[PDB]
């Protein structure tokens, strides 16, 4: 406890000395409090105007206007402690799981080097302004790597000075660059090195990109089994446990020298220990400490969601197929049987799952997975908007199954070959390409904006009548070599400035595993649409009279828009699309 913290906390005290109260009406149960001192401050979301001039019929489709308008109270719960079989049955899967993800990796520290070049191309870090303006200025001046260094040989001296988090179903938490540097040292292995990848974990499907996720969950169909499971957890962050964070730690039992040291630093003093500091408008800064939930860098937070949801979901597969009987106690016999399933057959049940963070589908053995609850409801992963101890329903059709917000679609070419596409109501894809984050956009980061969501439509969504129209009409309204641009950065083949058939060929043929004849398409006219049914039922406008003068007048809206861009070179990708060509 407060040996850990303590230092932390009594460094903040004395940088808000005037300030520091320890307050009576805090309105912490679960968060240990240890005092409060004055603040006042907080972004919204903005409209991107180019999109929206050109999707004119959805100005009156409140799904996609509602999108740019705008439970604390789950942050603030406690998850009890698991029994003592289900912490023997995580601690033998955790040190399994670990063993096979390493059998072909090697942990290693990442670099300065790395880090630099990560912020001098904006991912988004979760760091904060203070002493330098951004994170591209503190990582040139030398003064910031001295700070970094006496808070590394106090890590090596096991104890913490400056990691602290700032809080603000979306809960993030931010620390200053030096502390995310000191994480990604010790920890960026697992995303930079693909330690999720579907070829390194089975079950994961870190790197595969939107257009191998639907090919993925149809080859998860081909097993022999039950129905496909895709129970979400009910506010997963929250409902890590201490005993996760500990099965999580034993990455660096396969570690050694400084970096053992530097990694068993952060899980100790950063992650089973937390520093947080909340903006209460009663205005106070609140300084609050708990051992348990996640609350890591957003990238770390990724690769050790997936690891505990693999975890977690082996776990209830054992379940099902009855290697033990009660999470009550495990018998010393139990332990060999879960033991000898993981050797036998635990690469078998990995493949049977796709698992990006909290998010899984699970093609079990049979159903009897359905009714498997006792480990996954102790574990604390409780399942959303289901009873307890309801069955699970399950889904017949891999074309029905909901993940990572899609579904996917079995779409034939006119020649025969077939392609799995990623799909989502065409709402929210408007909705969301009409939003931009922050301020200070000039009309071109604007435009390049919009220019990154129409390549996206054309490589991903191509398939949808209404966002095949809208990306040609974006590309045809911004120049043609103005660069596509975003804020925080899946694979993204659409961020180029390569003609986007040239890009589908590469991404939907000659790249595509699961396409065996290579012949390249020639045309957009030989890439096929959902029949329109489908298209309507995925929330096409086709077959209404906004939608009908919006494609016909297509050349006025984006007039409109290039007129506002001014005189610059476009190029008209309309004739692509067979209605326009003459
Ligand atoms: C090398 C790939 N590539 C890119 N990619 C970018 C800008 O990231 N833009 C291109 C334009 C023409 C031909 C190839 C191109
Ligand atoms: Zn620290
Ligand atoms: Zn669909």
Same mark, same amino acid.
């Given at each position: 406890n407060l040996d850990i913290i303590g230092k932390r906390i009594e460094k903040i005290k004395? #940088?808000?000395?005037?300030?520091?109260?320890?307050?009576?009406?805090?309105?912490?149960?679960?968060?240990?409090?240890?005092?409060?001192?004055?603040?006042?401050?907080?972004?919204?979301?903005?409209?991107?105007?180019?999109?929206?001039?050109?999707?004119?019929?959805?100005?009156?489709?409140?799904?996609?206007?509602?999108?740019?308008?705008?439970?604390?109270?789950?942050?603030? =719960? +406690?998850?009890?402690?698991?029994? #003592?079989?289900?912490?023997?049955?995580?601690?033998?899967?955790?040190?399994?799981?670990?063993?096979?993800?390493?059998?072909?990796?090697?942990?290693?520290?990442?670099?300065r080097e790395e880090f630099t070049r990560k912020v001098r191309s904006n991912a988004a870090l979760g760091a904060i302004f203070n002493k330098w303006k951004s994170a591209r200025e503190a990582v040139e001046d030398s003064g910031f790597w001295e700070l970094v260094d006496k808070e590394r040989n106090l890590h090596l001296e096991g104890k913490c000075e400056t990691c602290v988090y700032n809080m603000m179903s979306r809960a993030i938490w931010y620390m200053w660059l030096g502390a995310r540097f000191l994480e990604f040292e010790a920890l960026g292995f697992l995303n930079e090195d693909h330690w999720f990848s579907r070829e390194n974990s089975l079950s994961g499907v870190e790197g595969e990109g939107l257009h191998k996720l639907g090919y993925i969950l149809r080859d998860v169909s081909k097993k022999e089994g039950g129905a496909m499971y895709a129970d979400d957890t009910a506010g997963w962050d929250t409902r890590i446990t201490l005993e996760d964070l500990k099965n999580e730690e034993?990455?660096?039992?396969?570690?050694?020298?400084?970096?053992?040291?530097?990694?068993?630093?952060?899980?100790?003093?950063?992650?089973?220990?937390?520093?947080?500091?909340?903006?209460?408008?009663?205005?106070?800064?609140?300084?609050?400490? +708990?051992?348990?939930?996640?609350?890591?860098?957003?990238?770390?937070?990724?690769?050790?969601? =997936?690891? =505990?949801?693999?975890?977690?979901?082996?776990?209830?597969?054992?379940?099902?197929?009855?290697?033990?009987?009660?999470?009550?106690?495990?018998?010393?016999?139990?332990?060999?049987?879960?033991?000898?399933?993981?050797?036998?057959?635990?690469?078998?049940?990995?493949?049977?799952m796709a698992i990006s963070g909290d998010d899984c589908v699970v093609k079990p053995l049979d159903d009897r997975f359905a009714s498997a609850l006792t480990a996954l409801n102790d574990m604390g992963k409780v399942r959303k908007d289901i009873q307890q101890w309801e069955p699970s329903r399950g889904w017949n059709d891999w074309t029905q199954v909901p993940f990572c917000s899609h579904h996917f679609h079995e779409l034939i070419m006119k020649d025969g070959r077939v392609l799995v596409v990623p799909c989502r109501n065409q709402d929210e894809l408007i909705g969301r390409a009409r939003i931009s984050q922050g301020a200070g956009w000039s009309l071109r980061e604007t435009a390049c904006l919009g220019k990154s969501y129409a390549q996206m439509w054309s490589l991903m969504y191509f398939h949808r009548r209404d966002l095949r129209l809208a990306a040609n009409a974006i590309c045809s309204a911004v120049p043609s070599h103005w660069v596509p641009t975003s804020r925080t950065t899946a694979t993204h083949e659409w961020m180029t400035t390569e003609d986007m058939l040239t890009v589908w060929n590469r991404v939907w043929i000659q790249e595509n595993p699961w396409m065996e004849d290579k012949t390249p398409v020639e045309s957009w006219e030989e890439i096929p649409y959902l029949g329109k049914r489908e298209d309507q039922w995925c929330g096409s406008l086709i077959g209404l009279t906004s939608r009908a003068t919006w494609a016909k007048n297509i050349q006025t809206a984006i007039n409109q828009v290039r007129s506002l861009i001014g005189n610059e070179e476009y190029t008209d990708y309309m004739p692509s699309m067979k209605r326009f060509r003459r």
């Amino acid at each position: 406890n407060l040996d850990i913290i303590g230092k932390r906390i009594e460094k903040i005290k004395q #940088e808000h000395e005037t300030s520091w109260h320890y307050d009576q009406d805090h309105p912490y149960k679960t968060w240990a409090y240890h005092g409060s001192y004055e603040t006042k401050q907080t972004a919204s979301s903005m409209v991107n105007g180019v999109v929206r001039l050109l999707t004119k019929p959805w100005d009156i489709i409140p799904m996609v206007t509602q999108m740019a308008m705008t439970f604390k109270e789950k942050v603030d =719960t +406690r998850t009890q402690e698991p029994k #003592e079989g289900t912490k023997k049955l995580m601690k033998i899967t955790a040190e399994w799981l670990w063993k096979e993800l390493g059998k072909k990796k090697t942990p290693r520290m990442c670099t300065r080097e790395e880090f630099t070049r990560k912020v001098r191309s904006n991912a988004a870090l979760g760091a904060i302004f203070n002493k330098w303006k951004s994170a591209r200025e503190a990582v040139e001046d030398s003064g910031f790597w001295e700070l970094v260094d006496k808070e590394r040989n106090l890590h090596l001296e096991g104890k913490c000075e400056t990691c602290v988090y700032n809080m603000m179903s979306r809960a993030i938490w931010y620390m200053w660059l030096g502390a995310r540097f000191l994480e990604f040292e010790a920890l960026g292995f697992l995303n930079e090195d693909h330690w999720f990848s579907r070829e390194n974990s089975l079950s994961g499907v870190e790197g595969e990109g939107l257009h191998k996720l639907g090919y993925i969950l149809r080859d998860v169909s081909k097993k022999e089994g039950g129905a496909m499971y895709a129970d979400d957890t009910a506010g997963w962050d929250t409902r890590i446990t201490l005993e996760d964070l500990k099965n999580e730690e034993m990455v660096t039992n396969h570690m050694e020298g400084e970096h053992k040291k530097l990694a068993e630093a952060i899980f100790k003093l950063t992650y089973q220990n937390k520093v947080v500091r909340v903006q209460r408008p009663t205005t106070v800064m609140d300084i609050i400490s +708990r051992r348990d939930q996640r609350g890591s860098g957003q990238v770390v937070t990724y690769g050790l969601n =997936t690891f =505990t949801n693999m975890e977690a979901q082996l776990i209830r597969q054992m379940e099902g197929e009855g290697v033990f009987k009660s999470i009550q106690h495990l018998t010393v016999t139990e332990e060999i049987a879960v033991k000898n399933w993981l050797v036998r057959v635990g690469r078998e049940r990995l493949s049977r799952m796709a698992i990006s963070g909290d998010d899984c589908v699970v093609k079990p053995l049979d159903d009897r997975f359905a009714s498997a609850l006792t480990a996954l409801n102790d574990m604390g992963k409780v399942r959303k908007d289901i009873q307890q101890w309801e069955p699970s329903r399950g889904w017949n059709d891999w074309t029905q199954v909901p993940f990572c917000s899609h579904h996917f679609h079995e779409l034939i070419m006119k020649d025969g070959r077939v392609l799995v596409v990623p799909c989502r109501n065409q709402d929210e894809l408007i909705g969301r390409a009409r939003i931009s984050q922050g301020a200070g956009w000039s009309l071109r980061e604007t435009a390049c904006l919009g220019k990154s969501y129409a390549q996206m439509w054309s490589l991903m969504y191509f398939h949808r009548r209404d966002l095949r129209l809208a990306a040609n009409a974006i590309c045809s309204a911004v120049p043609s070599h103005w660069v596509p641009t975003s804020r925080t950065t899946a694979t993204h083949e659409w961020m180029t400035t390569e003609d986007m058939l040239t890009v589908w060929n590469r991404v939907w043929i000659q790249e595509n595993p699961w396409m065996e004849d290579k012949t390249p398409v020639e045309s957009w006219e030989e890439i096929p649409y959902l029949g329109k049914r489908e298209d309507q039922w995925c929330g096409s406008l086709i077959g209404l009279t906004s939608r009908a003068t919006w494609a016909k007048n297509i050349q006025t809206a984006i007039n409109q828009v290039r007129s506002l861009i001014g005189n610059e070179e476009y190029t008209d990708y309309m004739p692509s699309m067979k209605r326009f060509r003459r």
